[PDB]
Design a protein around this ligand. Structure first.
Ligand SMILES: CC(C)(COP(=O)(O)OP(=O)(O)OC[C@H]1O[C@@H](n2cnc3c(N)ncnc32)[C@H](O)[C@@H]1OP(=O)(O)O)[C@@H](O)C(=O)NCCC(=O)NCCSC(=O)CC(=O)O
Ligand SMILES: CC(C)(COP(=O)(O)OP(=O)(O)OC[C@H]1O[C@@H](n2cnc3c(N)ncnc32)[C@H](O)[C@@H]1OP(=O)(O)O)[C@@H](O)C(=O)NCCC(=O)NCCS
Ligand SMILES: [Mg+2]
Ligand SMILES: [Mg+2]
Ligand SMILES: [Mg+2]
Ligand SMILES: [Mg+2]
Ligand SMILES: [Mg+2]
Lengths: 150, 150
């Protein structure tokens, strides 16, 4: 419970960023992962269009999410794109994911954004059930195409 | 079309950008739309994580797409997100969409990107048939959630 802290990472928070990436690595079961150098990660963290939120128990990162800002041409109110969200396997199903989403939308609300969106694979039943429990405004069925470049 | 030119907009291409946005308004049939101030749109075009491609016959923009750069923490090579794509309704089905997609992926390959991705609504049959003809590496069923902020 309230021991749980949500923190938006700042530029002097590289070690917490790396901690979160390691969390992503374990929860998503990424194989043979080679983390990019700290120079590259620091520059990413320093971008004005990128926001990381972590969940903390004392100094344990037990969950987190990453998000990108997409400036619009349809409107001056930006969009936020939640890219990854994960909670440590030993801490899932305890309200952390929800608190992360809540804090994230609250932050972009204060910033006057129009909308925050997030995606899940249609086959990921548990992810779909989670996002549906966060009372989103709406959900849409879509097809994601990608081009692996040479 | 051997008079068709494909062009990547630079910082001094605001008039073409505005022209593409009006094309988007018409083709997407947006109602009661107000285009943002030019100073807003000019700053967006100035961003180095935002790239616009347009299709031209003489001075006339007949199509185009917008794309966002998403820097990764999984790799040093960025992702590109194709956000909008449209061709003037009088000029559809003549290869313009393909050339746009081709030029876009060629650009991002030259920049050392890992991947380009794009999304179409499940009900958008014509959009889906188009993307499925552009030889995408893969396609995934995805559910898209959004939070409309106050
Ligand atoms: C999805 C999570 C972040 C969700 O956060 P939490 O686990 O903290 O859940 P939390 O309690 O806030 O949210 C509570 C509720 O989740 C769903 N709930 C309850 N039990 C569940 C269960 N057994 N399985 C799945 N969902 C369950 C319910 O709606 C319950 O709500 P109630 O009780 O009210 O009904 C986490 O489970 C996780 O890290 N999963 C790993 C995969 C993942 O995160 N995938 C998303 C895409 S990121 C990505 O990019 C992955 C990839 O593709 O590689
Ligand atoms: C979808 C759109 C961008 C496609 O561009 P376009 O220039 O019309 O498509 P192209 O001419 O480059 O297509 C090459 C081909 O792709 C697939 N294709 C494209 N349009 C198709 C269609 N309307 N029906 C079936 N297949 C189609 C085909 O193989 C067509 O090839 P062929 O004509 O040689 O068989 C354009 O029709 C459009 O602006 N539509 C409305 C807006 C929209 O849906 N935007 C995308 C939203 S995700
Ligand atoms: Mg801090
Ligand atoms: Mg009117
Ligand atoms: Mg303004
Ligand atoms: Mg610039
Ligand atoms: Mg064909």
């Amino acid at each position: 419970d309230n021991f749980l802290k949500i923190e938006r990472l700042a530029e002097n928070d590289l070690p917490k960023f790396i901690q979160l990436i390691r969390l992503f690595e374990a929860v998503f079961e990424m194989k043979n992962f080679s983390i990019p150098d700290s120079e590259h990660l620091q520059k990413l963290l320093n971008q004005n269009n990128f926001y990381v939120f972590v969940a903390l128990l004392e100094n344990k990162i037990v969950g987190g999410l990453t998000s990108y800002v997409l400036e619009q041409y349809y409107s001056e109110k930006p969009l936020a794109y939640i890219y990854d969200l994960a909670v440590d396997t030993n801490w899932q199903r305890q309200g952390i994911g929800k608190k992360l989403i809540t804090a994230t939308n609250q932050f972009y609300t204060e910033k006057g954004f129009e909308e925050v969106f997030v995606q899940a694979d249609k086959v990921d039943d548990y992810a779909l059930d989670f996002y549906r429990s966060t009372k989103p405004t709406a959900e849409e069925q879509v097809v994601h195409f990608y081009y692996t470049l040479k």
